[PDB]
Amino acid sequence: MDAEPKRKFGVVVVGVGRAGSVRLRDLKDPRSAAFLNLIGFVSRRELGSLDEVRQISLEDALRSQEIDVAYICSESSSHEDYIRQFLQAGKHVLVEYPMTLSFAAAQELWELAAQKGRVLHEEHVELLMEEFEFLRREVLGKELLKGSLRFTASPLEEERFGFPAFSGISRLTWLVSLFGELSLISATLEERKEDQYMKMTVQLETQNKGLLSWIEEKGPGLKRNRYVNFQFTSGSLEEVPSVGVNKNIFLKDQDIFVQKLLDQVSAEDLAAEKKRIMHCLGLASDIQKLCH
């Protein structure tokens, strides 16, 4: 520490699986290096030294005053605990969705963040996807009669990554962002343990009663895929441009987090995002209750 004003925010990355490794790689990007600098990283594995910084203990990350920001990239089941501890320690926090696997817990963290005067940011890169922007432009001025969004992928351990409504909350986020706040009508969950198969089907309604079906399907034989079928009073939409993953999509999310750090996001925008985030976590929580 030194009292001469500094140019950047010091960052600690907590958990270094695919997401944490991408955040570390992204910290090496030039323009992102104008505002941030990696201080250390925390991991359940013995990595020791990455990008020239030493691995540090959680205790050490929490106590260090050189660290202004924590990127929580651990398994989802630990997100809540890590966010709580870092906000308690006075760090701004960026966390990959879902921020928690509990609505009431998320409420507590938002309150803690406000009390500590820290930024709490839940990353949702799905809203930065090129095909999502396409969809947003296409549904504009149209009225949804009925639609479905299905995502198929491989099995996911619920103990570590959450119940499917939480682990797949990015698909629900798409629907809410595209069509507004949704009414939960019903939910069912089919599971065939012998086949490692799971299918969650959720019926939702837009405010004007357009029907939406959200399906999360997981099985060892499923190709990772998204299926969109939106029927409007004026035409239908079943194809979205075929786009590959964008290596810089997390940097786009980081740009938003940095604007929040610099106090460059309006109170209006901050409130609308939190309201959407909490609406989705509340739906996921209730969906889980309905699936029993």
Swiss-Prot record:
The modification N6-acetyllysine is found at K247, K252. It comes from Rattus norvegicus. Monomer. GO terms for cellular component: cytosol. InterPro entries: Biliverdin_Rdtase_A, Biliverdin_Rdtase_cat, Gfo/Idh/MocA-like_OxRdtase_N, Gfo/Idh/MocA_Oxidoreductases, NAD(P)-bd_dom_sf. The keyword NADP applies. This is Biliverdin reductase A. The gene is Blvra. The modification Phosphoserine is found at S154, S177. Its main location: cytoplasm. PANTHER family: BILIVERDIN REDUCTASE A (PTHR43377:SF1). The modification Phosphothreonine is found at T173. The keyword Transferase does not apply. One of its GO terms (biological process) is heme catabolic process. It holds the Pfam family Biliv-reduc_cat. One of its GO terms (molecular function) is biliberdin reductase (NAD+) activity. It catalyses: (4Z,15Z)-bilirubin IXalpha + NAD(+) = biliverdin IXalpha + NADH + H(+); (4Z,15Z)-bilirubin IXalpha + NADP(+) = biliverdin IXalpha + NADPH + H(+).
